[PDB]
C-alpha cells in the first residue's frame, strides 16, 4: 500500500521506448513537481523492453512493462501506481 519509490527503465534509442522517452521529455517535470519527496529514478536499458518498477513498503516490487506504449499510456499507468488502483 505504501509506495516507497518508482523506477522507469527506458532504452535511449530503441523504437519501443519512444513513448516513454516522450513522457520524460515533456511530462516528467510536472510529475516530479507534484511529488517532491518521491524517489523517481530514470535509468537506461540496452536491448530489453522498458520497465516500471514500484517499490512498496517492506521491499515489495512490481514491474509493469511499458513496451510500445504512448506518452498518454505511460502517464495513466504511472498515475495508477500513485493512486493505488
Partner 1 sequence: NLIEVFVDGQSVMVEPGTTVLQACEKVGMQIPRFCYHERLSVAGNCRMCLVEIEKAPKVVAACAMPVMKGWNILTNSEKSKKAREGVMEFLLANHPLDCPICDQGGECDLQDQSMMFGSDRSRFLEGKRAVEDKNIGPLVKTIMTRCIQCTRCIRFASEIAGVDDLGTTGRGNDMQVGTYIEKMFMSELSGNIIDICPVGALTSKPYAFTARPWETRKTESIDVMDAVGSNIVVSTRTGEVMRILPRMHEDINEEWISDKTRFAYDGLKRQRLTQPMIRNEKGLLTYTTWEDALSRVAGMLQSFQGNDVAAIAGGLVDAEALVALKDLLNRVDSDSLCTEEVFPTAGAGTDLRSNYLLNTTIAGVEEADVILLVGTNPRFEAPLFNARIRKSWLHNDLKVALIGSPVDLTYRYDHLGDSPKILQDIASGNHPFSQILKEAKKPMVVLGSSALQRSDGTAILAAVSNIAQNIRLSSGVTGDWKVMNILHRIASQVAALDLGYKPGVEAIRKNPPKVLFLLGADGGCITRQDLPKDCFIIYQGHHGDVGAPMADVILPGAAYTEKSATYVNTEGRAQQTKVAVTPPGLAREDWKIIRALSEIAGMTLPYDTLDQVRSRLEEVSPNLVRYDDVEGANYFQQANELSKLVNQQLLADPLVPPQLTIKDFYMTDSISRASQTMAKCVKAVTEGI
Question: Would you tell me which residues interact with partner 1 (CB under 8 A)?
Answer: 4-5, 7, 9, 12, 24-25, 28-29, 32-33, 39-46, 48, 53, 55, 57-59
Question: CA-to-CA distance for 13 and 34, rounded, in angstroms?
Answer: 28
Between residues 39 and 76, which has the closer beta carbon with respect to partner 1?
39
Q: How many residues does the chain have?
A: 85
Between residues 43 and 76, which has the closer beta carbon with respect to partner 1?
43
For strands 51-56 and 40-43, give the pairing: unpaired
Hunting for cell 504512448 — which residue is that?
70
Question: CA-to-CA distance for 55 and 22, rounded, in angstroms?
Answer: 23
Min. distance of Cβ 73 from partner 1 in angstroms?
A: 20
Between residues 15 and 57, which has the closer beta carbon with respect to partner 1?
57
Amino acid at each position: 500500500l505504501g509506495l516507497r519509490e518508482i523506477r522507469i527503465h527506458l532504452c535511449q534509442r530503441s523504437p519501443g521506448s519512444q513513448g516513454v522517452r516522450d513522457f520524460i521529455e515533456k511530462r516528467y517535470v510536472e510529475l516530479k513537481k507534484a511529488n517532491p519527496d518521491l524517489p523517481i529514478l530514470i535509468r537506461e536499458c540496452s536491448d530489453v523492453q522498458p520497465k516500471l518498477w514500484a517499490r512498496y513498503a517492506f521491499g515489495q516490487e512490481k514491474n509493469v512493462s511499458l513496451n510500445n506504449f504512448s506518452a498518454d499510456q505511460v502517464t495513466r499507468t504511472l498515475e495508477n501506481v500513485l493512486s493505488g488502483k
